[PDB]
Amino acid sequence: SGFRKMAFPSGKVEGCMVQVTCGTTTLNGLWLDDVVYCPRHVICTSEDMLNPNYEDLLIRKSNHNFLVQAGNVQLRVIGHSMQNCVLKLKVDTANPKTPKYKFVRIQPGQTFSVLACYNGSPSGVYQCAMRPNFTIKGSFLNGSAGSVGFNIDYDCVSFCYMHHMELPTGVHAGTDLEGNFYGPFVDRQTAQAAGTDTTITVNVLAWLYAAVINGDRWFLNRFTTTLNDFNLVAMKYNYEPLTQDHVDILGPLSAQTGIAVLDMCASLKELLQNGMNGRTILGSALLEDEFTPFDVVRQCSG
């Protein structure tokens, strides 16, 4: 019993975190096989990040310019390439703790676990959702960049995130591990602002089902309704429209509880109108949207 914001164990990722130094610029890098992956603005000085050209900042640079410490050991850079906003340092030494891994591009709505690092040494782990506005409410300081986001299947680490920058609202922007930013952002200190953030509807609906499974039922009613009509009412609290795919993936949780998805939407509606009346759900006083159906099935069943 219980429901808690729960990260993947971080061991496998911990064994791949190195620091990358270039000039007096330092951040974290991802050591998989004989390649380290890191954010490219490591090649930047403080003096040349208002408006940089990376394709030459790299031609201006040499293997020997790249320092990679893997705890005690230094790693010899025998090659470098750039692919979008990430650097790929080839190194003389395959990571002997390399786990099974894929690289994946996740959707707005999907969760991952973030191993936060400083100077290549891992600091802490926490669960994050990719917001609809393609940012994440993370907890990062100076030297957090190259910290990665991941999901583990059994023993397969899928890397979906690498960390670059902090928007001026306290939320975070990064790339996949092919270096393509999530959302319309770019790695330079020009004026950027996130598109206004929607709520992850399906996620809150999975989070209600999670609360039923742990006892809290008070927010339920005999009211059912029409997807289109619940949508018309969601579009009025900044909820993303809920698709017919979104209903399908709640299918399992709707089964285990006997509460039909449409019925839970009417439960969501009546919450948004009247609020929680100084009540709690799963220990929270507001509707939590950073929990995927999978997140919840993973905790609540076996």
């Binding site: 007096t24 954010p39 990062f140 960049a145």
Partner: peptide, 8 residues
């Protein structure tokens, strides 16, 4: 916007 490398 802040890039979260250490530039010191």
């Amino acid at each position: 916007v802040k890039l979260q490398a250490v530039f010191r």
